[PDB]
Amino acid sequence: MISDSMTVEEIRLHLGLALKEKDFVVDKTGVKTIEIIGASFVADEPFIFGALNDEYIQRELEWYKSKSLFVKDIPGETPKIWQQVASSKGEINSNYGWAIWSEDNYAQYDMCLAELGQNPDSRRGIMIYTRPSMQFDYNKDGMSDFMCTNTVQYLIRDKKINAVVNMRSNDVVFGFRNNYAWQKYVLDKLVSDLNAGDSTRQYKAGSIIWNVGSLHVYSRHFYLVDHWWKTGETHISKKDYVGKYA
Amino acid sequence: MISDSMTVEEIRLHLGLALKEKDFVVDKTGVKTIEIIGASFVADEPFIFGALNDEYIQRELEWYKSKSLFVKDIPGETPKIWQQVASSKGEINSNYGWAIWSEDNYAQYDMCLAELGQNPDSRRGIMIYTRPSMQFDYNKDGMSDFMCTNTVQYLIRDKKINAVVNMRSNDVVFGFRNNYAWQKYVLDKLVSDLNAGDSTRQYKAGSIIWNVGSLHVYSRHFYLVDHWWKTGETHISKKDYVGKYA
Ligand SMILES: Cc1cn([C@H]2C[C@H](O)[C@@H](COP(=O)(O)O)O2)c(=O)[nH]c1=O
Ligand SMILES: Cc1cn([C@H]2C[C@H](O)[C@@H](COP(=O)(O)O)O2)c(=O)[nH]c1=O
Ligand code: NA
Ligand code: NA
């Protein structure tokens, strides 16, 4: 039994209610947010609010395939957000290709693939992204990057592979869209690798379940929530939005 | 906004449905289980099925206060389960007092207390129990102890301190009852320590939210589920149970 969770549509609704309520909490940067504490839902759409950007996602995936911990190695011009959280030397913590494909984080992908190839029913098929020393590593050399993804667990049931994603913190607009594309790519690769190992397995991709301690919208994206609250459209250009949260 | 989750009562219901359905999955030990994948609920009662045992809980808490990684240091006679998962030398991984009070796991309690004493609104107040090297450490010296608790996050909102518990795996009957008593003790201590630091804070304990990749019942406890399914009583002695799952 997979848990019958909220869907992306219902998360949209609860965010709209928080905004209507004026239930604000002060970000570390001083900015207001709206927040769901302890959120859990099935990721049945590839975005919550906003639009897709295959070009950027493909650049972030090439960076993950390189496993580099330096933001300059992102193909093309590196985004400003990555520059602002990096150390004095351009270093970060959150390269998810490093987290799952590097020997330095204990070969999470290959060990999860070996565990499930040996025991398809296991509860120990997991890729652990964060680490206890994060209590001190988050601000090494002046960076500001406390890992947001804690763990991802994989469970094979009825010839489908399901993923359970646990995050400390996730931005609804950019974070969720990029992080979802990545989790789906990893899931499909794992399915294909298991199938090439044994042509009788015939596995397929299953569901992705999303769990978050603080799932939040920054006040700079309140307009998307408000517009969806009024119209049902999940995207509008900032230039075209008319409404209070300009 | 805390997420409006299932309660313990509703978890009881879904477990009863899995049992009725005969939706079984094979444990590593060969035994059948029933399972909810990706479960998330508020812990508003101190047990799901079964009875309380303050004596045993108090012994496990004294062991946690000692921080010892050896099962013999549990006060009095050490339980058989702890003996069966221990290494050739009596060693385990899962002492939660070690995980949060030892310098060797990077002082999780003291660093979370310092983070929240400095910024009550933070999203980085977390105690990280597991670690990436668990892909290799789970069977060190022949033990069988892949850490079950991944992380616990603390969020202070409206002068109440809420906890978000993330677990890979949890047994509904013994695991949940013992693990809940522990999480509530830590929460109350944190509240009291914050209040003694500043007599204007006046904080109080809030909600505990429980998230689990595989939340399961072993076939040896199917009787409790069945009895509750038939009668609404959350406990019965194994001697008194009449029914199929004898
Ligand atoms: C690196 C990363 C950051 N974030 C966002 C979540 C938070 O808004 C922010 C981290 O801020 P915090 O460490 O104060 O929670 O970055 C994601 O949503 N996904 C990611 O993968
Ligand atoms: C140490 C510990 C184990 N357990 C149970 C969960 C599983 O039934 C078992 C670990 O088995 P697994 O590693 O194969 O999932 O021990 C808890 O529920 N809580 C705990 O704190
Ligand atoms: Na670049
Ligand atoms: Na003992």
Residue numbers in the entry:
A (entry chain A), B (entry chain A): 1 to 246
Please share text taken word for word from the publication where this structure appeared.
Herein, we described the XFEL structure of dCMP hydroxymethylase (dCH) from bacteriophage T4 (T4dCH) at 1.9-Å resolution using the Pohang Accelerator Laboratory (PAL) XFEL. The dCH is the first identified viral enzyme from T-even phage, and it gives viral phage the opportunity to escape the restriction-modification system of host bacteria by the hydroxymethylation of a cytosine base. It belongs to the thymidylate synthase (TS) superfamily and catalyzes dCMP to hydroxymethyl-dCMP (hmdCMP) using 5,10-methylenetetrahydrofolate (5,10-mTHF) and water as a methyl and hydroxyl donor, respectively. However, questions about the cytosine modification catalysis remain to be answered because the methylene intermediate structure has not been elucidated yet.
After processing the entire dataset with a completeness of 100%, we solved the XFEL structure of T4dCH D179N at a resolution of 1.9 Å. Intriguingly, a bulky difference map was detected in the substrate binding site of the XFEL structure even though no substrate-like compounds were added during the purification and crystallization steps. A fragment spectrum of m/z ratio 321.0495 in D179N was detected at the same positions of the dTMP fragments. Therefore, by combining XFEL crystallography and mass spectrometric analysis, the unknown substance bound to T4dCH D179N was revealed as a dTMP molecule. The phosphate moiety of dTMP was recognized by the side chain atoms of Lys28, Arg168, Ser169, Arg123′, Arg124′, and a water molecule (Wat603), which formed a hydrogen bond with the main-chain atom of Phe146. For the recognition of the thymine base, the carbonyl oxygen at position 2 was recognized by the side-chain nitrogen atom of Asn170 and the main-chain nitrogen atom of Asp171, and the carbonyl oxygen at position 4 was recognized by the side-chain oxygen atom of Tyr96 and side-chain nitrogen atom of Asn179. Interestingly, the Asn residue of the mutant recognized the N3 atom and the carbonyl oxygen at position 4 in the thymine base, whereas the carboxylate of Asp179 of WT interacted with the N3 atom and primary amine group at position 4 of the cytosine base; this is shown in the binary complex structure. In comparison with the ligand geometry of dCMP in the binary complex of T4dCH WT, the ligand geometry of dTMP in the XFEL structure of D179N exhibited a critical difference around a methyl group at the C5 position in the pyrimidine base. Our dTMP-bound structure well mimicked the methylene intermediate that was the methylated pyrimidine nucleotide complex. We carefully explored the XFEL structure and found that this electron density matches with the sodium ion that forms an octahedral geometry with the main chain oxygen atoms of Lys72, Ile74, and Gly76, and side chain hydroxyl group of Thr78, in addition to two water molecules.
